[model samples]
Target chain A: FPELKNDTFLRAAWGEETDYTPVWCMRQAGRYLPEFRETRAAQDFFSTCRSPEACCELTLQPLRRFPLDAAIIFSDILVVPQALGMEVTMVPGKGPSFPEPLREEQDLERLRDPEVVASELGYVFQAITLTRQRLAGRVPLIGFAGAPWTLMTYMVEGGGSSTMAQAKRWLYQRPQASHQLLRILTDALVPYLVGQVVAGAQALQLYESHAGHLGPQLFNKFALPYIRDVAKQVKARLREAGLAPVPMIIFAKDGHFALEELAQAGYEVVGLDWTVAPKKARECVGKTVTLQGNLDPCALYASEEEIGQLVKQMLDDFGPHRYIANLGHGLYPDMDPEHVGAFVDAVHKHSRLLRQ
Target chain B: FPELKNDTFLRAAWGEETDYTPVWCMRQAGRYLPEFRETRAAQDFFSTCRSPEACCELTLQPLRRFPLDAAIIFSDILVVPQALGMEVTMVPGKGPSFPEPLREEQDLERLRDPEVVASELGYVFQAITLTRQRLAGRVPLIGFAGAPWTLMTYMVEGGGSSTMAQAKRWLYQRPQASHQLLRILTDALVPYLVGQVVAGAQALQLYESHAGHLGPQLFNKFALPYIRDVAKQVKARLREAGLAPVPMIIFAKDGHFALEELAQAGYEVVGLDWTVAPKKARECVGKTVTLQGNLDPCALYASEEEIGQLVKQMLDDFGPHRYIANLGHGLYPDMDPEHVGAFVDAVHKHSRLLRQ
Candidate 1:
């Protein structure tokens, strides 16, 4: 991989200064891109995820559409659970669901062994290595894994939940057991992320999609500690290898209460959801690390004029340095493609104008 | 009617340094209560809302079960629109829906007239009057209307929304036209609220459920201005009537960005949703007015022991004085009744213990 000396996104991710703000997007690829959909039409969702060529193609699709500063590898977070000997499948609109979920201590014990995880899920690293080669040093590829608590949530809840009722009840009801599951996943996550680094991916993003379900107390006790452990272990491994520390971005959706703790947790980029005020987040987290995201995806439906106005406000809020502009969350399924093009163009236009 | 001083809830609502933090759940008298269900079984949802005896019976159900400090008159916020000559019905499993929505200039013109609202919605004040007599000074009854902008969103969208697609599209696309509609609604709301107070409500709340939908700029231009106008108008009316200004609680859920603006909007009590940190909200809104709300309703699902711990934390977060303990939102439909009893008991127990 080429050295990332002048890459604005990488620099910002490390809290370095920049002339203009860098920008990238979460889920910049996949469903929104026509080419990605065409590829998906030819094969099943998991097949596309598992195939290195398909993953690389989907990763590049967003780059071709917009001038995104980085590219995240096209893969699902649940790939690890499948690797750990659980049955995982994406059923169309219904998100990842496990037919046989870990419901008890025996069920958890059945899945907790490390040998089962590594032996079964090693193809993920192979896909990462292949995609890194395909990128040809253009933009960094972000290799990601689900935060341990989040993975355990899907694993126990059997799928994506509307309310996360079972997961929360279990967490609050049997905290020690919940901690045991979190510890097991945390131990597994370190090797999983480290393996991606060894496989040549340039950066890592931790997706804590369900972090909000814990509220603050349980999050601090259970989720935050494990995420901190994973980041610390991953970065320590990179430094000990005499390699540069790979930039880490932590995207904890609805985990607004934990931003200061996350900043202290050693991640270089803290992602925000739409609810956080930009100026307040900047004040709380400070200029120590890069900030990503926080535009409401619903804004994409606005007219080009309104989109321009919204983009300008975000730029002003973040100022002209150490920021990577993106939506607070992924695009809604019904968003128009041309409107997304307008959104991207507006970001660039506003940034350039503001800097001048 | 007994003097308001005899009502413990009125004393608590006014921040009179009470023995307990007087509690009233938002939607306190809804589906969760058995008497409410029994009444609904005897009559349909609309008839119960429209009937004086049925609405009063449903209003008193929560107080019967739990020693709740207040009784919010059983009614719907959409009663204003129904009063404004729009067809409204509640669909089972789905929420309130309008079959034939007002989506045109002609419809807007027809609905904008304030006389159409005051005459048609007089039934709401009648219900509140009957319920107040039914309560007979056991507790102060709160009369509420949907804040004009929130009510307008439903009128425009034709119902509750997931993405608020139609409402926001109209808002951002036709700014001038949308504001025209907001202005009309505001004119109608002031008189409507004053009428409720005259008919016999001791307190009032403005429910701004959809306040978070607009990002800061549009919120300031649209929602906040109208809210300020309503507060000013209502208090001005109360002052002229020789009644002291009715204490107004502004529950602007998820509009955390505009709390300072909201505090200045002249509401006597500010209701916070669960997401905001209570201490932060108190500081932002300042010590001028009382603060209501902000326990995550899901906390009610935890074990009795856990609920005690959480309630203690909330009391610590908002000191005892000038705070009303309540759920941030309505009770979840299937919440364990035992858990809720535990939650309510915990609030009372913890508050008394802490004070002592």
Candidate 2:
């Protein structure tokens, strides 16, 4: 890959002082942009994901619209489950599901071994490599996978769940099976994440979207270990292969109780949902790690000026050093594109102003 | 309602010294119990809700099976919106929804007068009176309504939503209108809640299930004032009418960010979800208020022995006095009734053991 033109996000992740906080949206190239919808019109959800050209095009669209510090690869968290021999389908309106979700211990036999990602997920690697070249080093490229526990929730529950009852059932009633499934995911993620870095990802983020569903004890025993492992093993493997290790982030959405432990995990940065108070999060994670995210995406419902004001307030709360600007969660499909641009610009503008 | 019997729940809710923490599940008389389903077999959801005899039977079913310290009058939070001139429907497997939800400022004109509850919701009052009399004061009959912001969300979103975008848009783009709507809900709820008490409720709970959707700023602006108003107005009206006021609870599910403000918002008890650490919550809300809740309802999937152990740890974190034990949220329809019994039993057993 060409020399990186901007490494601000990486510097921020590593707890380095920066001129201004780097900003990016979680689902930067999502359906909010009209062009994203136009491109998506020709292909089904997973079909577009399989095409490196489409993924690269979708990835570039947001960068074209917004001066983002990072360009995350266009992908879904459910891709990990699909790679593990689950038939994952995404209905445009309904969301993802498994044709046959894991029910009993014997259902474990239906899954492919941990090495499945090495053979099955090259399209993602290819998309990362292609998108990297397409960017011409304008900004860092971010790669991500679902946390093992989060993936297990989707795999066992068959779809998104508010209760996560089925998955928690596996954890509480069938602890051994839950750990076994999580281990398989951890093993799969290590190789998959390593491959992304090899293919040209400069930074990686592990998304524990379902982390909020778990409490402290369940999260400590089941989710935290695998989150820690994904970072630790990926860095080790990259070092062994002589590839430079990338800065990694663990974004545990709505995981207020886990911040103290997540900062101690191997990742360089800890991501937060908007529900967390920035000052409290700082106290928990301390100054050693970078903090990313936490503007409510719904704040985009306001006017451009209002969005700017909100961004200024957010920057003041987080302050300027060792920080990144992002929505607490992904940008919704219905959000205004102008407000999103306003968010990106205000973040960049406010941080520079705050520093002086 | 005959001679009073168990006043333990009311005492603990008032932050008074008590022998053991009083326990009641949020949806104690919900679909998890076989008796609840059997009672509803001949009627639809709202039909069953409207029938005093049926509602009373369902409320008593869980109390019959478990030694619960309280019984919440069985009703839906959506009823206030229904009384406000919106039509709410409950699909058996789908959940509560409004067929024609509020869309714009003009939609306010479609609503009934704020005092409509004094006439329109007589059935709910009738049910509470019947249930309280049927209980013969066996346990406190708790009454509740959805928080104004939470009610606005359902009224605007038309159904259950992961994203409260439409409702929040009203807050941002149409601030004056949002306040007007919230004020309307506040006006409607005050009289409704007072009626609930006069009909024989010993306590009240305001459910803010959607509180997690707002950050502190939005919550403070849109939700807190109304929450404070309801308690203030209800108490004042009760005193003026020479009626005894009841202890009120604010159960904001997943609203970790607003605990401090909620504690000061004129409530005697603050309820927390499983995601919060009991120690941290105590520190945030402080000693003046009673803390209720916080075992993961899904934890009931564990063995009864394991459930007891988990409940013990929860009690240890919360300590004994000024506490009430309950599931962090409602019992899911899929939860085992046996496990629900185990949870109620464990809370009683461990809390008493801890106090000694």
Candidate 3:
């Protein structure tokens, strides 16, 4: 591995002292960037994921324009389900659509064995390695996968949904089958995440985007256990393979109810949506794990000056220690990239000023 | 009002004791019932709302089959926006569509003055009165409208949005304008809600469906004050009119962050989504306000036996005091009416057993 130049993100993830807060935006390399759209125009969504060189280019696009302390690997969360033999299509405007969703217990047979999923996801590992090499140690790269419950949501609901009623129905109506599917996802994620780290991902994020649909009872029963297992098993696998384990983050969008539990759930960092108060979130997590994110993505739609002010206020709330500056969620495609740049600049400027 | 047969729902909303919990699903009078669809086919969405007889029949349909403790007025939240002079259409399958949305400050002129909105919404008042009369005091009739923030989102963003970025953008970039729009909604809602009561609505609900999009800072700035204003002004108007004010409920779907503020925001009842724990919500809202709702609407997709058990568990969590039984959100179109019946039955059965 090349000698690292910017370890701020990695240090922040492990709760170490840094000169200033390290900043990155989720979906920084997205349609919001013209280069990202151009790259996307060249191929369909999944095909872009299938090509390691394209993924590497997308991952570095944002880094070239902004002095972000971290670069996340470019990929979609649904790739795991696709590897499991479910057919997923990226409809031009509709986002992800699974043409043949797993609706019944009998449908489980169509998926590949969980043990073989990491090998099937070789393109992601290749992307990680290529992206890391291309960076030449300028910054740490983040690798992420969908948390089992979130992945199971897309797999069961067949696509994006407002209600996720079909998936929640499975939880209440088919408890056994739900467990089987979640376990399959957890089993697959453990190996795939471990492979990313082995291939040079400095850190990992698990996105539980659909966590808001379930209350505490269902989340604790179904989502929490699998979330815990993924982190535990991923670390174990990396240790067995003589590779240094990377810091892990769990980002549950709208999962404010689960923060206390997520803090205790094995991960080194907890990512929050804007809905959680920064002071209250620190209180909930109890100062052990690093906390990342929580600026409303729409905040960037404001003027560059307004974006800076919002970023400054956000930094003051999270303070300088054990924090990574990022958006509460991802950047939207319609957002002005200049405002995104202002966000990055403000975090860097404000955090340093606060520390001084 | 003719001698009341079932005042349990009204009692529960007012934080009084009841023999058994009063249960009603949100969207109880919706397409989930075959009769609702049959009646809806006769007229377009707004036309059905305009006809008191159609609205009255739709409101009573679920009560006929399920013995539901309350009958909410059958109307759309978008009615307020439509009455405000926006051209809203019900897209065959896409739900509400606003062909001409309120975008700039100049767009404000297109709306009727807030004072005249009550006149434009005379149909809703007539529907409430008709439904109450038709019920013959069989059960309390509830009336509702979209809360200012929620309505503002639909008015600006044009329709449903996964991320209310456009609406939140208005909040950040146009603070004065955002407050202007919100106050306009609040002004309109005050008289409109009071009219529902005068026309025979026993209780009122304010639906802040898009509440989750903003964090605490933005919510307090853009959503909370207007919510407080609506409740305060409506009650003041009812008192000035010499009508005994009915209990008011605030249902902010996914507004888990604002529960504490919402509980203290002048409404007598604080409704919760399933994402909140009953006990946690009780703690946030305190015992002063009655708590309504929070079953996963999708829970009805389970078998009747499972629905019964889930209801029992939910009842245990809420206990037998200061609580109303209902789905956290509206029932889905595909839900079985028999399961909704089972939910209503189970709440009655479990509450009675617990008290004994």
Candidate 4:
């Protein structure tokens, strides 16, 4: 409710003109930052999420270090599944794991009723409100959830996998059960996302991180419908509550094949992985929605000067309009923070030069 | 040479019409088969490759169980790096690891000269010849090597990586050194590939397993030229030796973005990962090159009936002409051999029906 300051990211997402390209990294407030690691060292992964003050602190860490135009709420996508009553543990060096993953139809009963899910995710809402207040209108805050299909993968596969073999087996073998679980995720995500916006998230991102595992047919059948529903229902709920609708972004990492369909899938912006050529991405998604990201995160491992050049070239490719500069995917924990600073500086510096 | 009994795979690779689609899975002679595991237990990974008798037996194991049209040589892509004098070890469950990787330009001296590299790789050539002889015209024997960029990644990163961050860092910071390493790989691969054919490999494949990590610019710079060089140079060497050039295939896992360039990169067949749709891939590559692959390897985790249906749909998408049937990537170690049998049976049965 405080008077807004930097709305460049918001304007860019809505396809409005901005003086310069707004920039932020996915997972910017992460292990790559020493302060974040220190804060994280004090607690377990989910415990960090449960503490609103800690989450709020992590959210603003990147903003303090760089002149980022957006502050994404610091939380894990698995929280939605955890709220739905699945137990998830962040195993030290290993990623989030659910020891008892959802498999058979009988296992579906373990999930809490979808309607009551948001109350279980109150910590995230509290984090958003606290982060928004602490920022004092520095930049818009992004709230996100794992797209149903991606969440279903984590819930089914139990952890990170190169191939979501167990999850796809469910798609082919238990088509009905797959849809029931996907819909349950969609139902839970809708209200949780709406609550974030009500609590002061200025935008939303739906992360379909496991999109590359499925080809077009499976994505359209199982992932697309739920993706469409989440955006549609979240907007409806926000409108019904008399809250202003924030722009929505769908980041289907490696989902290049589904871009044409995703462009028409009710989101105002489409995020790309590093593999998609900027020019080809524009052609596929068409000109309506804003496009964000696609610099290879590894490019940051280059010298500061090389990072600057790569950023300049990426800006030239995407051009100045309807774009937000970010890495193709999340920043790696091993990335140099100084190199990250160079990336932010380059996007800001190059875009202004290009416009002039 | 003995009278060839089956050249369906070679025919498909050349974009020639076949009575039915020929089928082989990448890593068909792999841990998925119990016999492969039992044989593998006898020696270390590279040792099995070093013994022509061991390699020949492993290559024929899948063909013995199923009426497959092709038998690919059983060898690791890391063999080329090892031939170049890097110490590579198969770390039990961790896949490949390079204990001493190429980090600086000085590390180049650690490798054997590219010209003598083939002498170091004589075992692979012998294995190919032995496997061909053992097949006794039962099916075509395919030979393969890691594409330069992919091999470079393994060498630089020292093993499997979710992102080839350290490798790409070499690309950016050490541009001259990156080209030097890539060219060295290209030089070593050319002789090794040609020797496979000289020793009697009927077809060849180049695996750019780490292709997706780079975007178009870096791919074209670091991956494409070397790919073209390998194919062009290998064919030239075969021609100079008065050997008939064999069909060549390029399988760049998750290299969907580079399909157009890959098609024009001199290989007769362009292999695809499961992420690409058959029709879209056809459009990207045009009709000139034969297309192989793209069933999700995980699909084998489904029931026999479902595997049959998925194969039928994949064949339908690819159609009868200029296509080979294979999994999108290698079959996983845990996959059911019965399901792989179903896949091979379905492609053959359905293709014959479609032709009629």
Candidate 5:
């Protein structure tokens, strides 16, 4: 395997010299692109994700049209639960749902067989390997998993939520049981992420998508510690393999209050959603880590000129040297493909101007 | 009429030295209270809001139980839209819904005729008058309205939403039309709040619940100017009536980035949501205005011992001198009433410790 270089994406990720901060978005593929939908029309969302060949096609679909810097694997975080023997499925418009919620110790017994699901989950690693080979050194492939607390919310509640009310009630009302669940998830996520790294992933991102529901205190005790552990384990595994540890990015979507603690938690990058100020985040996190993201995805609904100007403002705030330009959150389902084009062009154009 | 310094709530609202900071949450008398529900047994939600006696009864429900520092008048912000002749109702389980939404210039024209509905809406002022008489000088009454932009969202979208997608689409896609709607809301809000003062409201609050949705540039352009205008109008109205200007509180929920801008927006007090650090808010807002709020309502779910420790930390951050003690946001509907009891007692007891 040739060492991955010659890619601006990797240079930006590692905080090396570049013309501008490289840009891409989470879920950049699958939804908005017509070509993406064209390919997936024959298969359901899960069928494509479970098959390495289909996942590879879906992963590369977004890059064909836009100048995106990286390609994240086309996969679902809930796949691990399915591998662990719980039944999970996505309803058409309703989001991911699970029939078997893990609320008791019997459920804990079911999740203990991580190796049983190892072969069942092998397609994700296979997807990463195939995509990396197809890129032919075009750009780095990002491998990711749901952060522990977020996965626990789904596993315990059995679905996506409006408020995570049931999950929160259990968290405050039944603290002992919730902690047991968090511990179970922490144990599973380590080997799951390491599997991707061994299969040719250049970086790993932990998506704490539902972390906003934890507020601050619960987040500190449950989510942050487990995230730190994952980063620690990934680094230790890389050291033993004699490979340089890939930079890790932890995105706690609405957990802005935890930036100071997160910066001290050993991750190389902190991904902020649109709610955090770049200037304030820099002050809180300090200078050790690269800041990825934070343009409001809704900003795409504005004119090309407005989107360009906003991108310029974000670049100037975080500075071209220590930032990765991307949306503060994922792309909304209806975001104009044309506006995404405008944003990509603007990030490069604005960062180039500032460098001059 | 009597120079207004006698009321504890009013004195605290002005940041005048007092026995304690006047603590009260937005929606303190909302659905969270079972007693409030009993008061509305026969009446629909909007009917209770529209009737003077029922509104006063519901408004006093929290004070009847808790040794709270102030009483907020019970009324929905959408009453302004009702006064403007848009068909509105509060559906059970679902939030407020408007059958006839403001979609075109003709819809805009109907609302401009404030004369026909002004007398019908006099019930809100009547409720405020009755609540004041009933309180008998126990605590000053707080009157509030939805901030213009917040009200405009409900008007455009016609109900509660997961994402204010339609309103935002209108905002970004048709700025001219949205701006036209915002201008009209600003004009009406000035008179509506002024009428509350005339009806014997001792203090006022502007609830900009959705202010965080505005990104930096849009907030500066759209939300700031109009809020500043409302503040100016409230003060000017008080001066004309030969009364001292009632202190104004601007509670911009989740609008942490706008702290400095809010300090200068002519409000005497700024109420912060849970996301902001109080010490940072104090530093950002400076010495002129008093700061209210910012305990996470979820903290109430902690043990009584833990609640006391958290209260001590909050007082230490904001300092006892110029801070108002209150939850960062409203109490959650299902929060244990006993826990709320513990939280309020701890705030009073712990804050007094700092004073000595």
Candidate 6:
């Protein structure tokens, strides 16, 4: 695959120093760009996801416009549940939704065995390989999956929730059942993540997007242990396969209370939400771990000049090393691409000034 | 009005010692009670809110069933927006919504003059007076308003938002206009709260429900100043009219980063989300400011035994002084009233036990 060229994102993820801060976004390959919409006007969501050519083109499209330091595979977090023998579809206006959610204990019986997850998602591996080869030694490719708690949230609730009441009720009422489901998701993800690495993914991220729904106690019980297990098992499996383990990031959205534990959760990097103060996040996660993100995604709504100023201020707060610049969350579909371009240029331009 | 009988909740709010901790829930008189739904099946959302009899009945329903220490008037926050010349409706399944959101600076011209708000909300005052007379001093009556920022959020977005991008975008793109709108809400709230006190409310709360969407910096600029101003103006206006200024609370839902500042924001108590740890919240707000709230509302979904144990642990974490127990947010509609009763009993039980 034309020998890997730019390793800035990888180096930053490893807590290593680089000439300037590397900038990428969480949903870099998303619908914010017009070309993405034009391409997607054609598929039933998963229909788009199933084709390797479409995924590779979508992954490469953003890189064509912005100088992002990393490229993530174009796929939704819901695809895993679909692979695990669940029925998932994208409702036109809403989001990924399950036709029948996990409502009772025996409903667990219908899921595909965790042992067979890697084989079922072979399409993901093939897609990642195709994107990596097409990149021709540009920025590194990243592969990720929803963290067990986050995946279980969707699996049990059937869709996005303003309050994760139903999922949390499962945690309180069916404690052991919750744990058993968490363990199964962990079993599924370990192999899924490792397979991505074997298929030419350079780095991995575990998105605990719904971490804040559980308070710290429930998170510790249902989320943190499974998160720790996923990373440990993935590293073990990679070593057993004689492959170099990739740098892994745990991006816990709104997990301000869990940063101290997430820092110790065996990942090289910790991603933060904008609500978390940068100085406080550094204090919580400490100096050893690399930090990514924390700008308000809506800041892109400002004029280009304002976006530049905001980026400069963010770079200063995070300092010049062990840092990667990205939005605290993914880009919204309405974000102006020109302003997004401004954010990338601002990070690159000002970060070099900080180094000097 | 009958003489005040139980002032335990008032004592805790003033950081004074009490016999035992006082407890209440945010939406104590909410849809979780089947009685509330039966009564509410009668109106076009606001049609119910506009009725003093219906509002008074809903406020009294939960207290009749649980030994709650305080009574909050069962009026929706969006009522103030409706009074301010905005069109707000409760979508049958969806919650409060604005028909046409504030889109640009000129939209501000359409709002009712802030000086006239108290007169516009005379119905709310009458309702509070009706409920207070009905309570006969069984417990203190609490009145509340949406903090300026949260009110503007709905006014701008026209509905509930997962990412408050439209509102946050206004903060960045039109700082002067955002502040101008915030000042109007603050001006409107001051008199509205004072009139509620004049009409019989013994305490007040400012619900900054959407505080987490803004980072600390944006919160300080757009939310905190207005929150502080509402308290200062309300207290001053109350005293100026020869009325005893009621104790006030600032409940910044999910506002972990702003707690320290909120402690000094002129409110007697700070309400917290379930995500915050009691020990940590205590340290942030310090001993001077009383702390209220912070149980996950979904905990009510558990069996009564589990609910009691969870409430006990929450009480122990908060300790026994200058504290009020409440659900982190409102109770979901699906929650069990029996379990809600159990939470109240457990708090009364464990808190008295803690003081021993």
Q: What value does the TM-score of chain B take for model 5?
A: 0.94
Q: What is the DockQ of each candidate?
A: 0.29, 0.74, 0.78, 0.67, 0.40, 0.79
iRMS per model, in Å, is 3.1, 1.3, 1.3, 1.7, 2.6, 1.1
lDDT by residue for model 6 (A136-222), tens:
879899999999999999999987787576788898888888888888899999999999999999999999989989898999988
Tell me how far the alpha carbon of residue A111 in candidate 2 is from the true structure, in angstroms, after superposition. 1.2
The pairs that clash in candidate 5 are: A294-A328, B295-B328
Writing each residue's lDDT as its tens digit, candidate 5 over A1-356 gives 56555567666666677876789988898577777777775687666777899999989988888878888888988887777777876666646678778766466777756545556778998998999888777778899998888888888888767435566666766678877777667667777788888888888899887776665666887788888888888789778888778878888877677888888778778898777888988998887778899988888899999888889888888887667888877887777889988999998888889988
Give the per-residue lDDT digits (tens) of candidate 6, residues B1-356: 99879999999988889998899998888777888888987775777778899899999998899889999998888988889999875576766788899999999999999989889888888889999999999999999989999999989988688757688988988989998999999889988998899999999999999998899899998899999998998889887999888789999988999999999988999999999999999988888899988999888888889888799899999989889999999888878878888899999988898878
Worst 10 residues of 3 chain B by lDDT: B88-97
Residue B109 in model 4: shift from native, Å? Answer: 2.5
* Local distance difference test, candidate 5: 0.79
Which pairs in model 2 have colliding backbones? none
Ordered by DockQ, highest first, the candidates read: 6, 3, 2, 4, 5, 1
Candidate 1, residue A253: lDDT: 79
TM-score of chain B of each: 0.95, 0.98, 0.98, 0.98, 0.94, 0.98
Give the alpha carbon lDDT tens digit for every residue of B149-208 in model 2: 999999998978874579877888899999999999999999999999999988999999
User: Model 4: how far is B86 from its true place, Å?
Assistant: 1.8
Using lDDT as the yardstick, the better of models 4 and 5 is 4
1 or 6, which is superior by TM-score? Answer: 6
Q: Please list the residue runs of candidate 2 whose C-alpha ends up more than 4 Å from where it truly belongs after superposition.
A: A90-94, B90-93
Residue B123 in model 4: lDDT: 84
lDDT of 2 at A351: 87
Error of 3 at B356 (Å): 1.9
Candidate 4 Cα misplacement greater than 4 A, ranges: A90-95
Candidate order by TM-score, highest to lowest? 6, 2, 3, 4, 5, 1
lDDT, candidate 2, A229-343, per-residue tens = 8888999999999999999999998899999999999788889988899998999988888899989888898889998888998899998878988999998998888889999
